[PDB]
């Protein structure tokens, strides 16, 4: 119902549904790497440079896109299709946060003399977890699947993220120290079997991350070997937050986990019935044959619906 | 008649709430600083006097204040503004914790020769926190905060008082033994990274205090890393009343959370019903007007009854 | 009910009530100490020999007690006061366990040329916690206290006493080596602080016991610190057998704890029913006195039933 | 049709029974040693050559059998004797994982030159806990133990694969470490009392595997001591992949258990409602013989009515 608006695109339409799974998979990349690329690096190596501009260019398109895209109304629950109304909608729900997470932010922070404030707005690309949350509503209001597994999906989802986040923002606060003061750091003074990280500043990317994300996904589980552990007074503090945090959201995992299995299977209410009819059954005596056709038509009861 | 017992304050009317946010505040503070000038002060220094008294000053008012505030008696369901009724209730209820609270401890510690004994008495200090239970009280009756979020919100009130004090009192431990010994404290045996925290007693008192909570939000979140840990012996005993109490408020935490998560949502009914319809409707196909219709009608039961 | 039999006792006589109160105090006393007297002593030192006779006593008379008092039968509720038919029961039902643990078990052991096996007997005197299961079997079954409660009550009990056990265990375990060998046990072996439980044996008890309490404490909360650990082969499968009992007791006192917290309180069945009502009349738009009367009305139905 | 071809099994004959019970115990063995044989040898020693080759025979002949057996359909819900019928089950189901798991993969591995991806193959032969797995659902199928008990009970013996396969698995990664690295693995570096585990692949098997699963077991719970933990990279990685999977595992066990709490009993539902009743009772003191009249009419409900 959209002849006069012919430029709008219909949210359903099968073409933007490929860009919108394409987005999807952008913002993961872009919500996962922003973290690293804050933490691990104080400005980006020129291996992945074109990394940075592309990624931010899919995400441009997007900026623009949500411009010509319809939508459904919360008030009147009515497609709105009117163009005007798509671009201030747009404008003041999210363009902002879009648009300002599209810089670059690598770039800028390079040509303004190295300036780490400048690198702290990196955080803003993790506005694009935006993506992800509506996916999961999306596949929340998908029927097919159960609507517990999704929470239970949704929060092991933002554990990821949260433990990745963490992992980063803990390399970063060792980073934040100068490296002659390196040895008051968790990972300066982190010393593993043979391997100690000393000059960790020029450790393999990846072997600080792997420890860095270990160190997150134990603290993570409440296991805590100790071999790393806060050290400075920030990395105190953020382990603190981190963990007030988590204990909260694994209370929240355990608390979905168990409504999904409250909830009960059919199943469950099949065994809890025929549990109801075998006491009947005894306290009555009916008899093997009687007894073995009621439990057999049953059974082809619940299998039969 | 109100005006026959004037200047009796009503329960509910304005600019005796600002006062009641006002001590709830300072309640706050007083039960959290409390811990703090107890475990981490065996002196109050000159920089906190003024401090420490105008908060008593601010319960003394209190004292005042509800020696004129009416309330409502459970028996006749009225609000009383008689002026005896008052006072009576005030000293039966909670006046002597109230008024022993706002006693200059810290200065009578002082002028009676540095008795750890009297330093004690900053205990009596703690039963402020009934101002944040009468507020979480208020909270649970009111109805635009759902009891749903108070309910485990007061819990991780409980949780961050706890863990708070307990990390005072780990804290307080460690100096109850003389410097000499400082070697079998917790603290004074500590060399976390490449800082050793020789003379503990001399370190910043922010510094002690990350420390401390540190070590008490690693063991409330269960995660006991192990760097910080329980060395004299009174320290294992307050570690195992810590830990023994924070098993069951973590376990109550979860518990909590669990029966927000079971108890569900309308909505939730709603998708459980439309989850089951949808998988008959989908097992025997019927077309999307018969869908159309039996959806409908499934959707004026939550949104009629 | 029984002319015949005068010598037998009713089980609610107030004199054999209070004896039964009496000898549960000595049966938690008895199933403490038993662990202890096995774990951390190769024989009762003297200064207790009688404390080791008297409390055997104290059990010996509950031998004879329950051969003449009564019982009441499962079947017909009838209390059967028949002396043959009660000693019967007893000594088919525990009199063997009752009259093993009731044995000198410490002067057996000391006589017989201090045989090691002869001090595991001592562990027949476990099951007089028999007696604190029946008071709480009795506790659910008084309707003055909540049955869940009951049952995180018993399951504290369990956690508390079996930790109490498994403290005990390390240590004796710990012993189980050879004093050259200590360096190989886990208390041997332990550098708490500037302190070294290098003669780990000729330390003081109550350091040692609260030494293992503390590692049996963290352990059951899964806190975890690391200070304290198993170093043994033995000692690595009790830690095992400890922690995945442990874990199985901790997620049964969640369990127990949030199926409380789900049965739900009459405040919260209020908090529900109360939102229901705001949410009929914020639909049918209810004028504010009418709305104020209802809401009145309401709270003053929940609170007179 | 059992008369039409001979040779078939009914499913439920006590042969084929007492067989389903023996080839339990030997996949529950086989898929318990196929990690252990895997991480802890680097090929099979000769003293366990003959236990290696019988037990494959023991599934040969599992295979064999198999193609002899009826089924009972989805379809007709009635038994079929028919070898066409029932070769092609098989074939498609289950025999082409089982087939592979009979091949003497020791034999192959030291045959082709001692190359590890060969000895690989070894973990097709976890797919004979699909008999566990059976066996736990036909025991799921039976009046006799609860279904939710039944699940934790799956849960709990997952757990115990999960957490020794884990333990393997560990060690196995410190194997694939040279030997002149060996400082740099987890076993290799650990120096547990006064025992260092230097030259860890000459130690005992069963210390060894003690040393792993004791890790396991403690990571499982959560309990993280420390004292063993992860150094390399692939340690960091395969410990983070269990301790989340350890997570997700454990929020599962902690929700099976509350849901069985949380469902409840008769008894408990009676005494929920009889509570009520007495709380009733009290608040308007009502006579005892009323009383018993409303308990008794009461207790008829609660009795399967």
Same mark, same amino acid.
């Not at 050290?231 to 953020?238: K, Q, Y």
């Given at each position: 119902?959209?002849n006069d608006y012919?430029?709008?695109?219909?949210?359903?339409?099968?073409?933007?549904?490929?860009?919108?799974?394409?987005?999807l998979?952008?913002?993961?990349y872009?919500?996962?790497?922003?973290?690293?690329?804050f933490?691990?690096?104080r400005?980006l190596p020129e291996?992945?440079?074109?990394?940075?501009?592309?990624?931010?260019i899919?995400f441009?398109?997007?900026?623009?896109?949500?411009?010509?895209?319809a939508?459904?109304?919360?008030?009147?629950?009515?497609?709105?299709?009117?163009?005007t109304?798509?671009?201030?909608?747009?404008?003041?729900?999210?363009?902002?946060?879009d648009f !300002?997470?599209?810089?670059p932010?690598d770039?800028i922070?390079?040509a303004?003399?190295?300036?780490?404030?400048?690198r702290?707005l990196?955080?803003?690309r993790?506005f694009?977890?935006?993506?992800?949350?509506?996916?999961?509503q999306?596949?929340?209001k998908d029927?097919r !699947?159960?609507?517990?597994?999704?929470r239970?999906?949704?929060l092991?989802?933002?554990?990821?993220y949260?433990?990745?986040?963490?992992?980063?923002?803990?390399?970063?606060?060792?980073?934040?120290?100068?490296?002659?003061?390196?040895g008051?750091?968790?990972?300066?003074?982190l010393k593993?079997?043979?391997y100690?990280?000393?000059?960790?500043?020029?450790?393999?990317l990846?072997?600080?991350?792997?420890?860095?994300?270990?160190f997150? !996904?134990?603290?993570?589980?409440?296991?805590?070997?100790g071999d790393?552990?806060?050290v400075?007074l920030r990395?105190?503090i953020?382990?603190?937050?981190?963990?007030?945090?988590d204990?909260?959201?694994?209370?929240?995992?355990?608390?979905?986990?168990?409504?999904l299995?409250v909830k009960?299977?059919?199943?469950e209410?099949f065994?809890?019935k025929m549990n109801?009819?075998?006491?009947?059954?005894?306290?009555k005596?009916?008899?093997?044959?009687?007894?073995?056709?009621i439990?057999?038509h049953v059974?082809?009861?619940?299998?039969?619906?």
């Amino acid at each position: 119902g959209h002849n006069d608006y012919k430029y709008i695109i219909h949210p359903k339409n099968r073409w933007y549904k490929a860009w919108e799974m394409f987005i999807l998979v952008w913002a993961i990349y872009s919500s996962l790497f922003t973290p690293m690329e804050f933490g691990f690096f104080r400005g980006l190596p020129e291996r992945l440079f074109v990394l940075d501009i592309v990624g931010q260019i899919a995400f441009l398109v997007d900026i623009v896109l949500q411009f010509f895209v319809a939508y459904r109304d919360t008030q009147t629950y009515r497609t709105v299709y009117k163009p005007t109304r798509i671009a201030f909608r747009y404008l003041k729900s999210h363009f902002l946060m879009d648009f !300002i997470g599209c810089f670059p932010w690598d770039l800028i922070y390079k040509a303004s003399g190295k300036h780490e404030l400048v690198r702290y707005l990196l955080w803003i690309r993790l506005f694009r977890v935006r993506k992800v949350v509506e996916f999961f509503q999306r596949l929340e209001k998908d029927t097919r !699947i159960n609507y517990l597994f999704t929470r239970i999906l949704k929060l092991l989802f933002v554990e990821v993220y949260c433990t990745h986040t963490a992992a980063c923002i803990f390399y970063y606060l060792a980073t934040t120290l100068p490296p002659e003061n390196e040895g008051y750091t968790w990972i300066g003074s982190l010393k593993l079997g043979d391997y100690s990280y000393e000059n960790f500043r020029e450790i393999d990317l990846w072997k600080r991350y792997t420890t860095a994300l270990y160190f997150a !996904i134990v603290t993570m589980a409440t296991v805590g070997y100790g071999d790393i552990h806060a050290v400075n007074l920030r990395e105190m503090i953020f382990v603190m937050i981190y963990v007030s945090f988590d204990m909260v959201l694994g209370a929240y995992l355990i608390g979905n986990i168990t409504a999904l299995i409250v909830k009960g299977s059919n199943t469950e209410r099949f065994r809890d019935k025929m549990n109801d009819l075998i006491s009947f059954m005894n306290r009555k005596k009916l008899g093997r044959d009687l007894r073995s056709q009621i439990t057999g038509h049953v059974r082809l009861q619940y299998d039969s619906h």
